[PDB]
């Protein structure tokens, strides 16, 4: 163990494996928006990272909010955070 | 070679014999550099005194039951291993515990020879019934760490597990702390519980001196630039 | 449906882009630069230059809004303009 220094009490399978770097990369996936462009049509935030867009809060997520009984979170998400 | 932002040692006292020390901030990874070495040093590197062996009068070949006492033999061995004692010179030093009248025996009823100290005189030892007689010999030596019982020779003398270390228990943990845009810096937390012989403070200080002496051996091979945190 | 990508791409070439609630709120805030230079002007001159340069009224209408002859409106316009030119020099601000 490189941290404590003690040996691990049991022999561990070791060897060489061929590992590939897949094209799903966190540099492309990470996105965050406080405020940004909105659609001229629906007046909701644009979608997609390239558009500096907001996250989709969908029907099932509203079901989750209602099952929690959180009224102000749900209203805030669907009004002042979107098309108000 | 470059200078590091100086880490600090803080003390949060829990009980008189129990304390948590926090060394922070440490450069990433160094919490595990200091942690296990400080724990093993605190446990095994501090010299202390304890009971090497005992001899109970009235029982030699048997060792199951002691007549005249409620506790059995091994239950006497247990709370005799809990005896907190300190000695000056290092030689086996014999002590004697004797009591007659019905009541309870404590560590104060043991007669310390000159140069030894019983730090927990209120510790229960055995319960003497009516007419019960208690005579036992306790050998005390100085050592380090925890040495298991070492027998033949003369009957009646039983070697016991000797807890030399003045520190009872040590556990450590490494938590994340943030220094200027880096949240991965190391924060070392040591939880140490000791006998009343010494404080956790002086135990950590003695461990520091010991390890400074140890790594001084590598320090002596040459004098070349290293990480310097002072100031 | 028109995609958000097409809306943004079209906005890149548009006279006014896609503004955000942040840009709106900060644009609604006081300048604290221009406002201070306007408050340093006396109330008559800042009023004349407000109705003239900022609002865009013709000069006669400024002479009507505040009750003054044409001469005080024009003179206060030129002097207030000069003083404001002194109080700030900016290629952009």
Swiss-Prot record, chain A:
Superkingdom in the source lineage: Bacteria
Transmembrane residue ranges: none
Protein role: DNA-dependent RNA polymerase catalyzes the transcription of DNA into RNA using the four ribonucleoside triphosphates as substrates.
Subunit (UniProt): The RNAP catalytic core consists of 2 alpha, 1 beta, 1 beta' and 1 omega subunit. When a sigma factor is associated with the core the holoenzyme is formed, which can initiate transcription. Interacts with CarD, TRCF (Mfd) and RbpA.
Family: Belongs to the RNA polymerase beta chain family.
Protein name: DNA-directed RNA polymerase subunit beta
Shown segment, full-protein numbering: 1012 to 1095 of 1178
From Swiss-Prot, chain B:
Domain of life according to the entry: Bacteria
A GO molecular function held by the record: DNA binding
Keyword annotations: DNA-directed RNA polymerase, Nucleotidyltransferase, Transcription, Transferase
GO biological process annotation, one example: DNA-templated transcription
E.C. number(s) listed in UniProt: 2.7.7.6
Induction: 3-fold repressed by starvation.
Region (Alpha N-terminal domain (alpha-NTD)): 1-222
Listed GO CC annotations: cytoplasm; cytosol; DNA-directed RNA polymerase complex; peptidoglycan-based cell wall; plasma membrane
Physiological role: DNA-dependent RNA polymerase catalyzes the transcription of DNA into RNA using the four ribonucleoside triphosphates as substrates.
Domain characteristics, as noted in the entry: The N-terminal domain is essential for RNAP assembly and basal transcription, whereas the C-terminal domain is involved in interaction with transcriptional regulators and with upstream promoter elements.
Family from the record: Belongs to the RNA polymerase alpha chain family.
Assembly and oligomerization: Homodimer. The RNAP catalytic core consists of 2 alpha, 1 beta, 1 beta' and 1 omega subunit. When a sigma factor is associated with the core the holoenzyme is formed, which can initiate transcription.
Protein name stated in the entry: DNA-directed RNA polymerase subunit alpha
Origin species: Mycobacterium tuberculosis (strain ATCC 25618 / H37Rv)
Gene that encodes the chain: rpoA
Residues of the full protein shown: 1 to 235 of 347
Curated annotation (Swiss-Prot), chain C:
Family per record: Belongs to the sigma-70 factor family. ECF subfamily.
Null mutant phenotype: Increased susceptibility to oxidative stress (H(2)O(2), cumene hydroperoxide and diamide, PubMed:12123450) and heat shock (45 and 52 degrees Celsius). Loss of stress-induced expression of a number of genes including clpB, dnaK, sigE and trxB, sigB and itself. No effect on infection of human derived macrophages, and murine J774.1 activated and unactivated macrophages.
DNA-binding region(s) in UniProt: 59-78
Function description: Sigma factors are initiation factors that promote the attachment of RNA polymerase to specific initiation sites and are then released. Extracytoplasmic function (ECF) sigma factors are held in an inactive form by a cognate anti-sigma factor (RshA) until released. This sigma factor is involved in heat shock and oxidative stress responses; it positively regulates the expression of itself, sigE, sigB and a number of transcriptional regulators as well as other effectors of heat and oxidative stress, leading to direct and indirect control of up to 25% of the bacterial genome.
Region (Sigma-70 factor domain-4) location: 33-84
Species of origin: Mycobacterium tuberculosis (strain ATCC 25618 / H37Rv)
PTM per Swiss-Prot/TrEMBL: Phosphorylated, possibly on 2 residues, probably by PknB. Phosphorylation of SigH has no effect on interaction with RshA.
Domain remarks in the Swiss-Prot or TrEMBL record: The sigma-70 factor domain-2 mediates sequence-specific interaction with the -10 element in promoter DNA, and plays an important role in melting the double-stranded DNA and the formation of the transcription bubble. The sigma-70 factor domain-2 mediates interaction with the RNA polymerase subunits RpoB and RpoC.
Protein name: ECF RNA polymerase sigma factor SigH
Other comment: Was identified as a high-confidence drug target.
Positions spanned in the full protein: 108 to 200 of 216
């Amino acid at each position: 163990d490189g941290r404590s220094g003690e040996p691990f009490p049991y022999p561990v399978t070791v060897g060489y494996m061929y590992i590939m770097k897949l094209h799903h990369l966190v540099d492309d996936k990470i996105h965050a928006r406080s405020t940004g462009p909105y659609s001229m049509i629906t007046q909701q935030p644009l979608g997609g990272k390239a558009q500096f867009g907001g996250q989709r809060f969908g029907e099932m997520e509203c079901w989750a909010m209602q099952a929690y009984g959180a009224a102000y979170t749900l209203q805030e998400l669907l009004t002042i955070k979107s098309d108000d | 070679m470059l200078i590091s932002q100086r880490p600090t040692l803080s003390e949060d006292v829990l009980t008189d014999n129990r304390s948590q020390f926090v060394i922070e901030p440490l450069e990433p990874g160094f919490g595990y550099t200091l942690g296990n070495s400080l724990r093993r040093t605190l446990l095994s590197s501090i010299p202390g005194a304890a009971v090497t062996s005992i001899r109970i009068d009235g029982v030699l070949h048997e060792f199951t039951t002691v007549p005249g006492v409620k506790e059995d033999v091994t239950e006497i061995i247990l709370n005799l291993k809990s005896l907190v004692v300190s000695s000056e010179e290092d030689e086996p030093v014999t002590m004697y515990l004797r009591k007659q009248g019905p009541g309870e025996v404590t560590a104060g009823d043991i007669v310390p020879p000159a140069g030894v100290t019983v730090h927990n005189p209120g510790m229960h030892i055995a319960t003497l019934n009516d007419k019960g007689k208690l005579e036992v010999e306790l050998v005390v030596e100085r050592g380090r760490g925890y040495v298991p019982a070492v027998s033949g020779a003369e009957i009646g003398r039983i070697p016991v597990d000797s807890i030399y270390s003045p520190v009872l228990k040590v556990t450590y943990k490494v938590d994340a702390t943030r220094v200027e845009q880096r949240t991965d810096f190391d924060k070392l937390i040591l939880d140490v519980e000791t006998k009343n012989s010494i404080s956790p403070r002086d135990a950590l200080a003695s461990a520091g001196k010991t390890l400074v002496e140890l790594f001084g051996l590598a320090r002596e091979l040459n004098v070349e630039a290293e990480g310097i945190e002072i100031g | 449906q028109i995609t958000d990508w097409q809306l943004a791409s079209n906005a890149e070439h548009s006279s006014t882009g896609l503004r955000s609630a942040e840009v709106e709120a900060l644009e609604a805030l006081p300048d604290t630069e221009i406002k201070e230079a306007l408050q340093a002007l006396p109330e008559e001159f800042r009023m004349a230059v407000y109705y003239a340069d900022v609002e865009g009224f013709p000069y006669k209408e400024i002479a009507e809004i505040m009750d003054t002859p044409i001469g005080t409106v024009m003179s206060r316009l030129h002097r207030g303009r000069r003083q404001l030119r002194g109080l700030l020099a900016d290629v952009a601000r």
